């Protein structure tokens, strides 16, 4: 009944992977490399903060912020542009608004049972994800 379901999620599968990086047109590559090399989605939670992370063999620098801080643009490693990225707790889940200019990066989570969904978008695409908690 509170934002602390602390665990792990191997992410049973991925619908779209490169196309999300594709959507923001990072480099129409990495789809052949980043494919999957341990990709373990994780969640941490601290109280006033929240930093889900991926323990991938390629990268470990994912959800890294505090709630309501309002991540007023300024990103890089992925896109490298400028988009309002507001974060909020739903009471149960992490709702964030990618207030874009061109795209709708609108990335959000929502515990859809015994796993944790990550239903984002990014202008045109719509990355759908499925998990299975631990």
Coordinates of C-alpha atoms in Angstrom, one line a residue:
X1 CA 0.0 0.0 0.0
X2 CA 3.1 2.2 -0.3
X3 CA 5.8 2.9 -2.8
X4 CA 8.3 0.2 -1.6
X5 CA 7.8 -3.1 -3.4
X6 CA 11.6 -3.3 -3.6
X7 CA 12.9 -6.1 -5.7
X8 CA 14.1 -6.9 -9.1
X9 CA 12.7 -7.7 -12.5
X10 CA 14.6 -9.5 -15.2
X11 CA 12.0 -8.2 -17.8
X12 CA 10.6 -11.4 -19.1
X13 CA 10.6 -9.8 -22.5
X14 CA 10.8 -6.7 -24.6
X15 CA 8.4 -5.7 -27.3
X16 CA 10.3 -2.7 -28.7
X17 CA 13.9 -2.1 -27.8
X18 CA 15.8 -0.4 -30.6
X19 CA 12.8 1.4 -32.0
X20 CA 12.6 3.5 -28.7
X21 CA 16.2 4.6 -29.2
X22 CA 15.1 4.8 -32.9
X23 CA 12.3 7.1 -32.2
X24 CA 14.6 9.7 -30.8
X25 CA 17.0 8.7 -33.5
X26 CA 20.0 8.1 -31.4
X27 CA 22.0 6.3 -34.1
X28 CA 19.9 3.6 -35.8
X29 CA 22.2 1.1 -34.2
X30 CA 22.8 -0.8 -31.0
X31 CA 19.9 -2.9 -31.9
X32 CA 22.4 -5.5 -32.9
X33 CA 24.5 -5.2 -29.8
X34 CA 22.5 -3.9 -26.9
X35 CA 20.0 -6.6 -27.9
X36 CA 20.4 -8.1 -24.5
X37 CA 23.4 -8.8 -22.3
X38 CA 21.8 -9.5 -18.9
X39 CA 19.2 -6.7 -19.0
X40 CA 17.9 -6.8 -15.5
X41 CA 15.4 -4.1 -14.7
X42 CA 15.5 -3.0 -11.1
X43 CA 13.9 -0.7 -8.6
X44 CA 15.3 0.8 -5.5
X45 CA 13.2 3.4 -3.7
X46 CA 14.2 5.5 -0.7
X47 CA 11.2 7.7 0.4
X48 CA 11.4 11.0 -1.2
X49 CA 13.5 9.6 -4.1
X50 CA 13.4 6.8 -6.6
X51 CA 16.0 5.3 -8.9
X52 CA 15.0 2.2 -10.8
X53 CA 18.0 0.8 -12.7
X54 CA 19.1 -1.6 -15.3
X55 CA 22.1 -3.9 -14.4
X56 CA 22.8 -4.5 -18.1
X57 CA 26.2 -5.5 -19.2
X58 CA 26.1 -2.5 -21.5
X59 CA 24.7 0.0 -19.2
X60 CA 23.9 1.0 -15.7
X61 CA 22.4 4.4 -15.7
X62 CA 18.7 4.3 -15.9
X63 CA 15.9 5.8 -13.7
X64 CA 18.0 8.2 -11.7
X65 CA 16.1 11.0 -10.0
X66 CA 14.0 12.2 -7.1
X67 CA 10.3 12.7 -7.2
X68 CA 8.7 16.0 -8.0
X69 CA 12.1 17.5 -8.7
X70 CA 11.0 18.0 -12.2
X71 CA 13.8 16.9 -14.4
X72 CA 13.6 20.0 -16.5
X73 CA 15.3 18.6 -19.6
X74 CA 19.0 18.1 -19.9
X75 CA 19.7 14.5 -20.8
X76 CA 22.5 12.6 -22.5
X77 CA 23.8 9.1 -23.3
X78 CA 20.6 8.3 -25.0
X79 CA 19.1 11.3 -26.7
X80 CA 20.8 14.6 -25.8
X81 CA 18.3 17.3 -26.2
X82 CA 15.9 19.0 -23.7
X83 CA 12.6 17.7 -22.4
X84 CA 10.6 18.5 -19.3
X85 CA 10.7 15.3 -17.3
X86 CA 8.5 15.5 -14.4
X87 CA 8.2 12.6 -11.9
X88 CA 5.5 11.9 -9.4
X89 CA 4.2 9.0 -7.2
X90 CA 0.7 7.8 -7.8
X91 CA 0.5 6.5 -4.4
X92 CA 1.4 3.2 -6.0
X93 CA 3.6 3.8 -9.0
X94 CA 5.8 6.3 -10.9
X95 CA 4.0 8.6 -13.2
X96 CA 6.2 10.9 -15.3
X97 CA 5.5 13.5 -17.9
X98 CA 7.9 14.0 -20.8
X99 CA 6.8 17.4 -21.8
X100 CA 8.2 17.5 -25.2
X101 CA 8.5 19.9 -28.1
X102 CA 8.6 17.3 -30.9
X103 CA 8.2 14.0 -29.1
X104 CA 6.1 12.5 -26.4
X105 CA 8.7 10.5 -24.4
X106 CA 6.0 10.0 -21.9
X107 CA 7.4 7.3 -19.7
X108 CA 5.5 5.7 -16.9
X109 CA 5.2 2.7 -14.7
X110 CA 2.4 0.9 -13.0
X111 CA 2.4 -2.3 -11.0
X112 CA 0.1 -4.4 -13.1
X113 CA 0.0 -7.3 -10.6
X114 CA 3.0 -9.4 -9.6
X115 CA 5.3 -7.6 -12.0
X116 CA 5.9 -4.1 -13.2
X117 CA 5.0 -2.5 -16.4
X118 CA 6.8 0.1 -18.2
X119 CA 4.5 1.6 -20.8
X120 CA 6.3 4.4 -22.5
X121 CA 6.1 6.2 -25.7
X122 CA 8.3 8.5 -27.8
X123 CA 6.4 10.5 -30.3
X124 CA 5.2 7.8 -32.6
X125 CA 6.4 4.7 -31.1
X126 CA 4.9 3.0 -28.1
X127 CA 7.2 0.7 -26.3
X128 CA 5.4 -1.9 -24.5
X129 CA 7.0 -3.9 -21.7
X130 CA 6.3 -7.1 -19.7
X131 CA 7.9 -8.2 -16.5
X132 CA 7.6 -10.9 -13.9
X133 CA 9.1 -9.5 -10.6
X134 CA 12.3 -11.3 -9.8

